[PDB]
Design a protein around this ligand. Structure first.
Ligand SMILES: CCCCCCCCCCCCCCCCCC(=O)OC[C@H](CO[C@@H]1O[C@H](CO[C@H]2O[C@H](CO)[C@H](O)[C@H](O)[C@H]2O)[C@H](O)[C@H](O)[C@H]1O)OC(=O)CCCCCCCCCCCCCCCCC
Ligand SMILES: CCCCCCCCCCCCCCCCCC(=O)OC[C@H](CO[C@@H]1O[C@H](CO[C@H]2O[C@H](CO)[C@H](O)[C@H](O)[C@H]2O)[C@H](O)[C@H](O)[C@H]1O)OC(=O)CCCCCCCCCCCCCCCCC
Ligand code: CLA
Ligand code: CLA
Ligand code: CLA
Ligand code: CLA
Ligand code: CLA
Ligand SMILES: CC1=C(/C=C/C(C)=C/C=C/C(C)=C/C=C/C=C(C)/C=C/C=C(C)/C=C/C2=C(C)CCCC2(C)C)C(C)(C)CCC1
Ligand SMILES: CC1=C(/C=C/C(C)=C/C=C/C(C)=C/C=C/C=C(C)/C=C/C=C(C)/C=C/C2=C(C)CCCC2(C)C)C(C)(C)CCC1
Ligand SMILES: CC1=C(/C=C/C(C)=C/C=C/C(C)=C/C=C/C=C(C)/C=C/C=C(C)/C=C/C2=C(C)CCCC2(C)C)C(C)(C)CCC1
Ligand SMILES: CCCCCCCCCCCCO[C@@H]1O[C@H](CO)[C@@H](O[C@H]2O[C@H](CO)[C@@H](O)[C@H](O)[C@H]2O)[C@H](O)[C@H]1O
Ligand SMILES: CCCCCCCS[C@@H]1O[C@H](CO)[C@@H](O)[C@H](O)[C@H]1O
Ligand SMILES: [Ca+2]
Ligand SMILES: [Cl-]
Ligand SMILES: [Cl-]
Ligand SMILES: [Fe+2]
Lengths: 451, 342, 137, 334, 81, 38
């Protein structure tokens, strides 16, 4: 029992996985077994979703989060996002499920059967956390893998069927992307946009050409930096700025993952291009704008001049100006005038919403789409009663956007706490006082008093 | 003199797994019956005849919505004894009339007395100062002011809090709509005591845990402490320097620090109890007269104070008919206060 | 109180013929109403047009009358405006527009009767709560 | 000894009466800016059109407020989540009308308070302490982010951020109950257990240590003079405390290890407040409290009210009256 | 220690489980039957799903007198046909 | 307003650089125990 109790290792059972820090072979086992769990869930959850899936209901009425990811990639769907073939969903699930047994097998082997340390067995697979050269080489391999992964999305988009394009003329459809955006002023210009309203930083990406071209740049960048980090070793300025230890490296990744979880939270909440509303339901901004549109349409059909209807506050009942003058929907949805969506843009002119188009060009499919999104607003209770908090039981609904945004905010928050925990501890362990103050060497006793 | 009294004293004070004591003769039956009454009532007993509410697992409620509800308003402040003139010894009627509520409230009151006597009794036998009992006066002040004095000032027990999760939430919202209780400075002091006490709890625990002396070799620092050691397990000097330089001030007296941790939440609860005594009589902090005079005359004058009263007015009108069924409020749709559209 | 055959007896047509639903039909009507209709009609109101509700008194004064099984079954095939003047299949779910309202694709004639029966029975149970909105919650 | 190294040694010096440090270099100017603007605005700012409907709310003392009703009012609903620094306004008078000060205060405050958390880590490193006091501070810090930043983002407007005022706080809480039924959300319930339990264990630890102080003084003097700052020996008898409290409940319900006792004191309120912060942060995306409205139905199908339905009636009253001129359409979807 | 037998001793002893493999399910089944026989309703006076209202009434049988409260409830119970 | 904007941009940039170069300036070694961290 090497390092498998508190006396040998110094770590109690509730910190038991810290006993693995310098047992690369068992540590390898733990990581591979865990990746098997991830792949297992992806496969099993997909199959569960498929078994419970009725093609006639919108995905967002059915508690689906994985099939929408597959459908967005262009598998199983046709014009308007209608499901034409569930077999791709089946394949994706089965293959992930079968693969998890391979990963589970390797993980269990390395964890309990194989060599506990790898340094004696193989200098290629062995590593020391303090070997800055080996650590950047391992990092380099994984950057190359990630860069290949990004290029697979490009290959799917350009050569293997395309992607579902909510903006496609004629209602949304799978479309092959032939001219991805390669202009670095466009691609990197997303990175310097303000993150505030009307700008939205990278969350604002609104067309597939930019999405695909962004993954070309990211693929190349990851492969290049992966080669760079194989061939190089950290420079002097980098050496002096960081802590070089297993726990420190963990803490940096925890920081990175937390940041990504917060970005994913906003992506799914605001973006309706790579999270199409056909599959995920309308965004919150979208459903609120859809209500204004619904009642503009109803009232105009009854004979109202919606352009000149003065509401109780003096602002237009249906239409008003944004603070920079654009014609926008009135009422409380004035806050959401930055929303763009395929069902609304046909009414947009150079000055914002165009009164002539509103009076003459509103098509029945737009009225349908707005009434659907208004009645599937992302509001609902924890027990999945859809609607405002005061609504009665009847509708079993919580938007996928709410499920995905709340879960990933919670996970991102706790991963930020984990970064602080492990970065603070890595710093203290490196400097040598993570177990407490040495009584005979208490630093404050050697310092001058403050007053 | 070793009579029966002293022999009984001997037995009551034996060092056993559960200490009993003289106080235990009051504490154990009363605590057991109050808890047993709450479990019995939330599992099997209705509120249909007193409130018009289902309130038991038997009826389909869950852990959040079960309650032992207060008696009907027409019972007044009746003790509602099982053998009293209302139930007249009939256990089923007694349950239907709300007898379990006074049963829980009264055995609970005497159970609380017994727990505090237990704190005095054990403290006297072990030889410690009785500050734990003194601190426990604050939960007693809260219980007595909210569950006894408040309804005794009102029309009947019906307006006391009912013993359940969602029933207590309704009690919070009633106090906002009718009493404007958030505006009351005695509640504000209670909030300060409760949040400040939670703050002291977090900060003291974290400070000790992060100024520990390295008194062992393991990475788990819990093992490096012996209950009989004479040394402080953490550095008061290092802790004092940390907070002086982070916050400006710090504790330097460890006895003051732990008295203060007693003082802050105990005082807060006592202050909140006083304000609730005022609410027993509807002696509310409802309004600021100067604000009302200005706003009556100047229809452009708006503050967060006037915004909240409109919310209170909504709470009163929309919840009163269902929440006070004995009053028979019929409010036609046209009289209900509502903003535009909603 | 109990869900009796009296409660489950509703007008079949305008001429005064009644039909008595089974408890299974009523419960099936409730499930299908939730499936296909409650996103806009929960509680008997109409979220996208609150002027029109599903109260029987409102349905009686529609053109043609909708306060009976045949009128409601016809509405789900070929819905009209309240005065009968216009056909609104293009913006209201119906069998005629099952291509654009896919949830209507797997409704059968028997399902339409059950949904219709639910709409006619619920006010007999709920009184003002049905079609009354938040005032009666 | 060049000038940059001199500056770095002063910044990180453990001898300054107040530690500065690298986090402090950001902390000090941002907190000063937020404090100065807050004080000026609280006293003298003119009314603010919070809900974007040209209906200004008076928040400052000079415009008819006292300490309890005063507030710095959130920026206008017409601005939503747009960035509104002073230089985006045509004049100070426009900026004041539209609630500009709110944005300036909370952005500088959230930066400053995040750096306050880093500063707690930083000084613990310079003094050779363990590092996790700042992890306890993350619980109140996450809560401020929840009501000033996260909740505005999910709802699409800083006008639904918490006002910077006493009665403004109450308004925020009441409307929150109407729109999310937060009382019925288990994360708020865990938060209540966090702060109720925190206050209980605070009085508990205080009373037990005070109850077992070792006699070192006469009755005419404060028992606090029995402890001397820096002394080596503990000032109370934890064995007598454990002996009392173990008998109050039972022996195994009591702590005799001061280290795990104090860890428990840290963990309970910090974890509870984390859950409270996460409740606000996830109700920001409209995953609301449990809805049992009309959950209980009799044999005929009559609704049988529970206490949940009475709560609903109260919530409706708050819903229909809040922001009484701001809604033109029947659903308050944000 | 206070002299009683340690709990860990007791609950890993075969004799404990010989006794409690009977007494635990027996109590559970007694509680089940208290409900399934309908006895819980009659002990406590709790309405069954079909006894909250009469068939056509929608008013609560609310107690409105202090000293005739018992007779009021009995009268409400008669009116259930 | 433009002068205000340039001023704030310059002020913010100043303090951010101090922060970054500050932590780049051998910060792991600024502790009371082990300096040799690199
Ligand atoms: C190392 C650390 C260094 C720190 C650097 C500090 C620099 C500033 C930090 C960022 C501050 C962000 C504030 C505003 C956040 C926001 O409004 O976020 C929103 C934006 C998205 O913006 C929205 O993006 C939208 C883009 O959608 C548009 O485009 C879409 C295309 O499909 C749709 O068509 C849509 O309809 C259309 O509107 C619109 O522009 C909206 O108006 C716009 O508001 O999110 C985004 O930019 C990406 C998400 C940002 C992260 C979210 C912050 C969370 C922080 C949690 C902290 C917790 C701490 C706990 C302490 C313990
Ligand atoms: C501290 C640590 C303590 C530890 C806990 C101890 C727990 C002990 C438990 C004791 C419980 C006491 C129950 C008191 C019940 C009560 O009061 O019952 C109330 C009765 C009076 O009955 C009420 O009387 C009212 C007024 O009626 C009168 O007026 C009517 C209208 O005009 C009619 O004329 C009527 O005939 C006439 O009686 C209404 O009728 C009410 O419906 C009816 O309930 O008083 C009475 O029994 C006796 C009243 C005199 C004694 C009061 C002292 C005790 C209460 C102190 C609280 C003060 C609260 C005031 C607000 C603050
Ligand atoms: C993803 C979660 C995860 C993973 C992958 C690991 C992995 C590991 N843990 Mg950790 N641990 C975890 C969670 C995890 N742990 C949790 C939640 C706790 C708190 C309870 C701990 C507390 C803890 C302690 C205290 C210790 C470890 C140790 C270990 C290592 C050795 C385990 C061993 O020898 O058991 C031997 C156990 C068995 C032989 C029994 C069965 C084990 C197998 C793997 C069951 C697999 C079943 C599976 C269905 C079979 C699939 C086969 C199929 C694919 C063909 C191993 C790498 C030990 C260590 O560090 O050693 C140096 C150690 O002392 N862990
Ligand atoms: C990739 C992420 C990651 C990895 C690899 C590690 C790895 C480690 N952590 Mg870190 N940690 C992380 C993220 C991570 N952590 C996050 C996000 C947080 C914030 C919560 C922490 C907070 C943390 C603390 C406070 C501590 C560690 C510690 C450790 C070490 C011992 C871990 C152990 O044995 O736990 C054993 C696992 C358990 C005892 C089980 C935990 C059970 C959780 C709480 C249940 C959660 C509920 C679940 C999600 C849903 C309910 C399920 C239920 C219904 C069945 C190990 C090096 C310890 C350390 O410092 O060692 C150096 C330590 O004291 N971690
Ligand atoms: C990314 C995470 C994620 C998200 C966003 C979803 C979302 C969804 N799931 Mg999925 N699922 C997940 C992971 C996720 N799931 C995992 C890990 C499993 C395996 C357990 C499943 C297995 C699963 C099944 C079997 C089903 C779903 C269903 C659903 C839908 C309804 C959810 C519901 O009602 O929850 C109810 C809400 C809760 C249970 C609240 C959980 C509270 C947790 C315990 C708090 C944990 C906090 C934190 C992690 C711990 C911190 C501790 C601290 C000390 C550090 C919704 C679309 C349902 C569906 O509609 O399928 C189509 C369904 O039947 N899911
Ligand atoms: C990234 C995860 C990972 C890593 C770094 C290792 C590393 C190691 N393994 Mg382990 N192992 C793993 C996962 C991993 N394994 C998995 C998933 C399984 C189940 C299949 C195993 C089952 C296993 C056994 C039975 C043994 C090892 C052994 C070893 C050691 C020697 C291996 C060697 O020299 O192969 C040389 C390299 C090759 C043969 C090339 C293989 C190419 C693969 C099979 C094709 C796919 C490549 C492509 C990148 C895959 C993409 C997968 C992705 C989509 C998830 C080495 C330390 C040996 C050992 O421990 O000695 C004592 C040993 O006997 N492994
Ligand atoms: C997983 C990804 C990853 C990781 C962990 C690393 C890690 C490392 N890189 Mg490598 N690198 C990568 C990918 C990665 N790299 C890729 C894809 C490329 C190709 C572009 C490179 C090209 C590269 C070069 C040329 C160098 C490194 C170097 C290093 C080392 C120093 C890191 C550092 O100081 O950052 C700290 C970050 C900075 C100092 C940037 C400036 C600070 C700004 C102001 C922070 C801004 C933050 C702000 C919130 C940004 C938000 C988003 C923004 C874009 C708007 C470190 C070991 C250095 C090294 O030692 O090489 C041997 C080095 O010279 N990397
Ligand atoms: C190390 C360790 C651990 C961990 C472990 C793990 C984590 C493992 C993993 C594992 C895994 C991860 C496993 C997996 C497996 C899998 C499998 C075994 C699968 C199978 C499949 C199948 C058989 C399929 C089937 C089918 C088909 C084909 C079709 C459809 C239908 C169905 C589904 C039926 C613990 C913590 C315990 C502790 C101790 C140590
Ligand atoms: C894909 C895609 C795209 C693109 C993208 C990109 C291109 C990205 C990039 C990105 C990037 C490029 C990022 C970056 C990041 C960075 C970071 C995040 C950094 C950090 C840093 C740090 C953290 C540092 C720290 C420090 C200091 C400051 C001082 C000294 C010490 C230390 C080092 C600690 C787009 C949008 C078009 C569209 C969609 C898709
Ligand atoms: C009232 C009254 C009385 C009494 C009675 C009694 C005394 C009773 C008792 C009763 C009891 C004594 C009952 C109990 C019950 C219990 C239960 C019902 C429990 C349950 C539990 C559960 C359900 C759990 C859950 C959980 C938690 C809480 C956490 C952890 C985890 C778990 C999930 C496990 C007499 C005759 C004198 C007279 C008349 C009146
Ligand atoms: C917008 C952000 C831009 C970030 C740019 C990142 C580029 C990285 C290059 C950093 C430059 C290297 O230059 C860096 O600064 C100065 C050089 O005088 C040194 O500065 C410091 O040195 C040592 C560190 O041991 C300290 O004791 C000393 O107080 C200080 O002078 C750093 O040790 C060196 O690493
Ligand atoms: C009330 C209890 C008062 C104690 S009473 C007391 O009890 C003694 C037992 O020690 C007897 O010997 C004695 O005669 C009797 O008066
Ligand atoms: Ca390398
Ligand atoms: Cl309001
Ligand atoms: Cl509106
Ligand atoms: Fe203490």
């Amino acid at each position: 029992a090497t390092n498998r109790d508190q006396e040998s290792s110094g770590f109690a059972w509730w910190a038991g996985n810290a006993r693995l820090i310098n047992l690369s072979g068992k540590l390898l086992g733990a990581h591979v077994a865990h990746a098997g769990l991830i792949v297992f869930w992806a496969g099993a959850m997909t199959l569960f979703e498929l078994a419970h899936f009725i093609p006639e209901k919108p995905m967002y009425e059915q508690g689906l989060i994985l099939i929408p990811h597959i459908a967005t990639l262009g598998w199983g769907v046709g014009p308007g996002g209608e499901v034409v073939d569930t077999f791709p969903f089946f394949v994706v699930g089965v293959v992930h499920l079968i693969s998890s047994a391979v990963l589970g097998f390797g993980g269990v082997y390395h964890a309990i059967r194989g060599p506990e340390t790898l340094e004696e067995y193989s200098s290629f697979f062995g590593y020391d956390w303090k070997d800055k050269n080996k650590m950047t080489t391992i990092l380099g391999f994984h950057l190359i893998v990630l860069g290949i992964g990004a290029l697979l999305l490009v290959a799917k988009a350009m050569f293997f069927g395309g992607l579902y394009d909510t903006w496609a003329p004629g209602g949304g459809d799978v479309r092959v992307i032939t001219n991805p955006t390669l202009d670095p002023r466009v691609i990197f210009g997303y990175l310097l946009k303000s993150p505030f309203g009307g700008e939205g930083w990278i969350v604002s990406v609104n067309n597939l050409e930019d999405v695909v071209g962004g993954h070309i740049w990211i693929g190349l960048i990851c492969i290049a930096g992966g080669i760079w980090h194989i061939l190089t070793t950290p420079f002097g300025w980098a050496r002096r700025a960081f802590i070089w230890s297993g726990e420190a490296y963990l803490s940096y990744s925890l920081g990175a993952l937390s940041m990504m979880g917060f970005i994913a939270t906003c992506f799914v909440w605001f973006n309706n291009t790579v999270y199409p509303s056909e599959f995920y339901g309308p965004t919150g901004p979208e459903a609120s704008q859809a209500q204004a549109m619904t009642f503009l349409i109803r009232d105009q059909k009854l004979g109202a001049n919606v352009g000149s209807a003065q509401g109780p506050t003096g602002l237009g009942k249906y239409l008003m100006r944004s603070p920079t003058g654009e014609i926008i929907f009135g009422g409380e949805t004035m806050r959401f005038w930055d929303f763009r969506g395929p069902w609304l843009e046909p009414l947009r002119g150079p000055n914002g919403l165009d009164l002539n188009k509103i009076k003459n060009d509103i098509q029945p499919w737009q009225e349908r789409r707005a009434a659907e999104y208004m009645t599937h607003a992302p509001l609902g209770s924890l027990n999945s009663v859809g609607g405002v908090a005061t609504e009665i039981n009847s509708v079993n609904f919580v938007s996928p956007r709410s499920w995905l945004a709340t879960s990933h905010f919670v996970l991102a928050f706790f991963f930020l706490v984990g970064h602080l925990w492990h970065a603070g501890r890595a710093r203290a362990a490196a400097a040598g006082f993570e177990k407490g103050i040495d009584r005979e060497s208490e630093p404050v006793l050697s310092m001058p008093s403050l007053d | 003199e070793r009579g029966w009294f002293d022999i009984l004293d001997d037995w009551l004070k034996r060092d056993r797994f559960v200490f009993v004591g003289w106080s235990g003769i009051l504490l154990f039956p009363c605590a057991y019956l109050a808890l047993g009454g709450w479990l019995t009532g939330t599992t099997f007993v209705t509120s249909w005849y007193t409130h018009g509410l289902a309130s038991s697992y038997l009826e389909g409620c869950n852990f959040l919505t079960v309650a032992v509800s207060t008696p009907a308003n027409s019972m007044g402040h009746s003790l509602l004894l099982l053998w009293g003139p209302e139930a007249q010894g009939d256990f089923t009627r007694w349950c239907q009339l709300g007898g379990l509520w006074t049963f829980i409230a009264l055995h609970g009151a005497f159970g609380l007395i017994g727990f505090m006597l237990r704190q005095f009794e054990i403290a006297r036998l072990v030889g410690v100062r009785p500050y734990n009992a003194i601190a426990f006066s604050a939960p007693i002040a809260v219980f007595v002011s909210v569950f006894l004095i408040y309804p005794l000032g009102q029309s009947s027990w019906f307006f006391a809090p009912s013993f359940g999760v969602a029933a207590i939430f309704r009690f919070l919202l009633f106090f906002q709509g009718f009493h404007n209780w958030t505006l009351n400075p005695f509640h504000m002091m209670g909030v300060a005591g409760v949040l400040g006490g939670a703050l002291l709890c977090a900060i003291h625990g974290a400070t000790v845990e992060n100024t520990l002396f390295q008194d062992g070799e393991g990475a788990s620092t819990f093992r490096a402490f012996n209950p009989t050691q004479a040394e402080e397990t953490y550095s008061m000097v290092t802790a004092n320097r940390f907070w002086s330089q982070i916050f400006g001030i710090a504790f330097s007296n460890k006895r003051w620090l732990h008295f203060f941790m007693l003082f802050v939440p105990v005082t807060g609860l006592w202050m909140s109890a006083i304000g609730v005594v005022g609410l027993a009589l509807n002696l509310r902090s409802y309004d600021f007269i100067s604000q009302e005079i200005r706003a009556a005359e100047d229809p452009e004058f708006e503050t967060f104070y006037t915004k909240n009263l409109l919310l209170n007015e909504g709470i009163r009108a929309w919840m009163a008919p269902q929440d006070q069924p004995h009053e028979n409020f019929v409010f036609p749709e046209e009289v209900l206060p509502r903003g535009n559209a909603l | 109180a109990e869900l009796t055959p009296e409660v489950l007896t509703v007008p079949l047509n305008s001429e005064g013929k009644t039909i008595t639903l089974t408890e299974k039909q009523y419960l099936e009507g409730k499930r299908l109403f939730q499936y296909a209709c409650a996103s806009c009609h929960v509680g008997g109101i109409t979220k996208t047009n609150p002027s029109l509700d599903l109260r029987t008194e409102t349905l009686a004064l529609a053109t043609p009358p909708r306060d009976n099984i045949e009128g409601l079954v016809d509405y789900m095939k070929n819905p009209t405006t309240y005065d009968g003047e216009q056909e609104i299949a293009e913006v209201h779910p119906s069998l005629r527009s099952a291509d654009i309202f896919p949830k209507m694709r797997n409704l059968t004639e028997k399902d339409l009767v059950a949904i219709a029966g639910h709409i006619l029975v619920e006010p007999k149970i709920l009184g003002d709560k049905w079609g009354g909105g938040k005032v009666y919650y | 000894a060049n000038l940059w190294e001199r500056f770095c040694n002063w910044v990180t010096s453990t001898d300054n009466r107040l530690y500065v440090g690298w986090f402090g270099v950001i902390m000090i100017p941002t907190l000063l800016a937020a404090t100065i603007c807050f004080v000026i605005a609280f006293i003298a700012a003119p009314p603010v059109d919070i809900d974007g409907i040209r209906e200004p709310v008076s928040g400052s003392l000079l415009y008819g407020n006292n300490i309890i009703t005063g507030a710095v009012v959130p920026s206008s609903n017409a601005i939503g989540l747009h960035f509104y620094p002073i230089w985006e306004a045509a004049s100070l008078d426009e900026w004041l009308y539209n609630g500009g000060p709110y944005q300036l205060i909370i952005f500088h405050f959230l930066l400053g308070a995040s750096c306050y958390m880093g500063r707690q880590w930083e000084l613990s490193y310079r003094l050779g302490m363990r590092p996790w006091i700042c992890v306890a501070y993350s619980a109140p810090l996450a809560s401020a982010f929840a009501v000033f930043l996260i909740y505005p983002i999910g709802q699409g407007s800083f006008s639904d951020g918490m006002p910077l005022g006493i009665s403004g706080t109450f308004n925020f809480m009441i409307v929150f109950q109407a729109e999310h039924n937060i009382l019925m959300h288990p994360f708020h319930q865990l938060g209540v257990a966090g702060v109720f339990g925190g206050a209980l264990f605070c009085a508990m630890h205080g009373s037990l240590v005070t109850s077992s102080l070792i006699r070192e003084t006469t009755e005419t003097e404060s028992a606090n003079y029995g402890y001397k700052f820096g002394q080596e020996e503990e000032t109370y008898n934890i064995v007598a405390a454990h002996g009392y409290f173990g008998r109050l409940i039972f022996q195994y319900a009591s702590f005799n290890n001061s280290r795990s006792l104090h860890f428990f004191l840290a963990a309970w309120p910090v974890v509870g407040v984390w859950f409270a912060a996460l409740g606000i942060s996830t109700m920001a995306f409209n995953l609301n409290g449990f809805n049992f409205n009309h959950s209980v139905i009799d044999a005929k199908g009559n609704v049988i009210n529970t206490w949940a339905d009475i709560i609903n009636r109260a919530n409706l009253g708050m819903e229909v009256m809040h922001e009484r001129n701001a809604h033109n359409f029947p659903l308050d979807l944000a | 220690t206070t002299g009683e037998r340690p709990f860990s001793d007791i609950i890993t002893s075969v004799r404990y489980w010989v006794i409690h493999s009977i007494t635990i399910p027996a109590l559970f089944i007694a509680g089940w039957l208290f409900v399934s026989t309908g006895l819980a309703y009659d002990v406590f006076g709790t309405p069954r799903p079909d006894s909250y209202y009469a068939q056509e009434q929608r008013s609560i049988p609310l107690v409105t007198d202090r000293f005739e409260a018992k007779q009021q409830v009995e009268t409400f119970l008669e009116q259930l046909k | 307003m433009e002068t205000l904007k340039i001023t704030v941009y310059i002020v913010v940039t100043f303090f951010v650089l101090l922060f970054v170069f500050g932590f780049l300036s051998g910060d792991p070694a600024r502790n009371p125990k082990r300096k040799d961290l690199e």
